[PDB]
């Protein structure tokens with residue numbers, strides 16, 4: 001009978017397939033009925049991006065930068081096949097790469113633990129956080145094929161040939177056809193990455209591990225290991241020793257293994273690509289991709305981009321296309337909204353907003369924890385192949401709706 | 411009371427730290443006593459590589475190329491810390507990066523399965539086989555630091571400006587200091603990697619998944635996806651449909667997640683860097699890094715390099731250095747030997763050797779399976795912290811020696 005007035009505007013980026021269905025239903029029954037928010041809509045569906053020539057993604061990202069908070073829905077990243085499917089103009093770049101490259105920062109990811117649910121990696125009991133660097137490397141590289149024999153070279157030409165000097169490093173000499181590419185990153189980005197990773201370790205009282213491959217990419221990865229170590233000793237080694245938490249660099253090999261056999265409970269900082277890949281493993285490993293939150297934070301600490309860790313769940317969308325029933329977990333999507341709404345509230349000092357968010361969350365999880373109403377993904381975790389063990393994609397969302405309404409009378 | 415003559419010679423590459431110590435005992439107590447082998451030795455310790463200016467590495471690589479079979483102990487790949495520890499000249503490149511780059515091929519790694527021993531990803535019940543592309547990408551890249559503002563271009567100059575034309579892509583425009591890198595790979599190499607993969611899928615009658623990140627590196631990762639598919643239909647899809655196995659390319663993100671929640675029982679052809687990182691996850695997932703074999707197979711199928719998949723085990727070596735007890739798993743190391751002897755045998759039609767290999771493996775595994783003698787990692791796998799559950803590095807090794815004697819009388 002009353003609505004919470006949200007101060008500043010929230011930027012919303014709509015997506016594709018299964019996740020677009022879930023999204024809408026979420027803001028219809030779970031968000032709009034309770035909030036007086038000014039949503040600045042941006043449709044990032046393939047058809048929208050195509051028609052707009054990906055320009056909209058530029059606009060969306062710059063909207064987020066402006067207003068501070070963004071809630072993004074899963075989106076189809078066009079690969080040859082996709083182009084055929086939607087008869088696209090170009091084979092557009094992942095909008096996630098464009099946004100992330102525009103905003104910068106780290107993408108913090110961690111599973112949503114529902115006690116009632118088992119775990120694929122049983123020994124894991126305490127949440128594992130992934131601090132994926134969002135800025136460069138291969139999500140902003142320059143790949144290209146190489147026709148026939150010739151020389152490959154990476155060339156650098158300074159602006160002021162007085163403080164530095166040119167470089168022409170011979171990369172290879174093809175004797176046949178193949179591929180090549182080059183990527184990059186900056187000291188500025190890595191430093192923010194480090195600052196954001198040390199802060200979260202301190203804020204959550206968890207040990208921090210930076211994983212790299214510095215024994216191979218001696219200079220490249222070495223810059224990561226070194227800046228981290230520099231910043232640490234510079235202004236965290238104090239609060240860390242005082243908190244009982246340690247920072248340590250390890251080789252990615254050792255770390256992913258150390259993790260697979262641990263009880264979870266620590267922060268893993270990784271380069272973009274590793275943050276990307278491993279986050280999925282952690283996700284799937286704690287239960288299902290349906291139970292992992294994701295949020296990009298800028299070094300500022302005043303800009304956010306909330307999203308689910310998974311994709312558009314195409315495989316499930318395909319079933320939905322042919323009148324077949326679906327059991328897609330919407331929990332990450334709900335949290336994508338709640339966590340977005342949370343940062344919105346802290347930024348504007350609107351505790352009414354933050355409270356609602358925790359209620360949204362508390363009700364979403366309890367519908368599983370308490371009432372035992374879960375989708376197929378979580379059902380297979382408990383060990384029940386039986387169809388009568390789970391509910392549909394819409395049935396679940398309705399149960400969350402119902403329990404939310406109850407938990408709002410208190 | 412008799413020795414097995416080994417027709418052709420075996421190239422042996424000694425290495426560092428705890429693995430060097432294990433290595434020695436293996437050959438003194440398990441290989442030399444039963445074989446008449448012309449072992450073409452090559453000490454690849456850090457010191458032996460430093461004084462030799464890493465040339466020995468080159469020599470060893472080329473020796474394996476010549477005599478067909480090489481067996482390697484784990485080596486230290488120097489980084490800044492190492493240069494200061496052993497007071498080295500240069501920060502030498504990984505001798506594994508150097509060997510693989512010279513032999514080419516695919517590195518097939520899978521877990522060594524010990525029934526009594528549990529698994530960290532219980533749902534896994536059938537061996538997962540990694541097919542790591544051994545040739546290029548970041549394991550033969552070129553990186554450097556960017557001092558200050560300037561351009562960064564990927565310059566390509568073909569030899570015959572008729573069949574192909576130069577390229578000069580603009581990678582980035584630094585507005586500050588950062589890092590830059592560039593890597594490559596050849597279509598020829600990829601064809602080999604693809605062929606090898608498939609053949610293995612058939613021989614072992616298992617599904618073949620190729621993972622990639624083409625949505626991001628459309629040209630680079632795309633090539634892998636394409637050449638793979640081209641080869642499939644070009645000469646395998648026949649035998650596949652016939653056997654009931656299905657090849658298939660998926661996004662890395664997906665494959666790692668599928669894998670984690672699967673029951674296992676498939677082959678994951680991965681790109682070099684991925685093959686590296688995933689194989690550790692997989693090995694640790696099945697029990698411990700110590701229970702996993704790794705062997706390089708050149709495109710020919712007539713050149714091999716057996717090795718353990720793990721490193722030199724510094725943390726343990728450190729304990730040893732100060733007169734403390736050790737519990738390092740030697741199974742990987744021993745199989746590096748056996749798998750190499752076996753490979754030598756299938757090439758010199760020496761069924762006598764192939765018999766020793768299998769009995770060696772047999773006894774190595776039954777020491778754990780039957781007699782219940784194992785190292786601390788396998789004890790904890792079983793869930794027993796109690797000191798009395800495992801035995802020292804040397805202790806375990808002696809047990810394999812003793813049981814080896816027995817099982818040989820038959």
Ligand SMILES: NC(=O)C1=CN([C@@H]2O[C@H](COP(=O)(O)OP(=O)(O)OC[C@H]3O[C@@H](n4cnc5c(N)ncnc54)[C@H](OP(=O)(O)O)[C@@H]3O)[C@@H](O)[C@H]2O)C=CC1
Pocket residue numbers: 073074075076077078096288289290309310311312313314315316327328329330332377625661663664667
């Ligand atoms: N950040 C973003 O916007 C991203 C977008 N994408 C895009 O999404 C599309 C599909 O990508 P894909 O490789 O399938 O990755 P997905 O995240 O869509 O993975 C789907 C697979 O994992 C399972 N899964 C994933 N999410 C859920 C969920 N919420 N509930 C239940 N199960 C789930 C599905 O279940 P099951 O095993 O039963 O089939 C299926 O196997 C592509 O266009 C891709 O580019 C991909 C990644 C990130």
Ligand SMILES: NC(=O)C1=CN([C@@H]2O[C@H](COP(=O)(O)OP(=O)(O)OC[C@H]3O[C@@H](n4cnc5c(N)ncnc54)[C@H](OP(=O)(O)O)[C@@H]3O)[C@@H](O)[C@H]2O)C=CC1
Pocket residue numbers: 215251253254257483484485486487488506698699700719720721722723724725726737738739740742787
């Ligand atoms: N192919 C090669 O020659 C390789 C060489 N290296 C080199 O090895 C050195 C050490 O690298 P590092 O990061 O420690 O990687 P390691 O392979 O040495 O990993 C050691 C870690 O994993 C565990 N572990 C690994 N192997 C075993 C084993 N056989 N038995 C029991 N436990 C094991 C150890 O257990 P615990 O948790 O108790 O410490 C330790 O945590 C470095 O110089 C690295 O460059 C690295 C990779 C490959």
Ligand SMILES: O=C(O)CCC(=O)C(=O)O
Pocket residue numbers: 076077094095096097276309310311625663
């Ligand atoms: O941009 C994309 O295609 C999705 C990348 C991805 O897997 C993720 O952000 O989780």
Ligand SMILES: O=C(O)CCC(=O)C(=O)O
Pocket residue numbers: 215253486487504505506507686719720
């Ligand atoms: O070369 C190195 O440092 C080790 C690389 C590695 O992890 C492997 O060969 O499995």
Ligand SMILES: [Ca+2]
Pocket residue numbers: 276277279280309663
């Ligand atoms: Ca991902």
Ligand SMILES: [Ca+2]
Pocket residue numbers: 253686687689690719
């Ligand atoms: Ca490895």
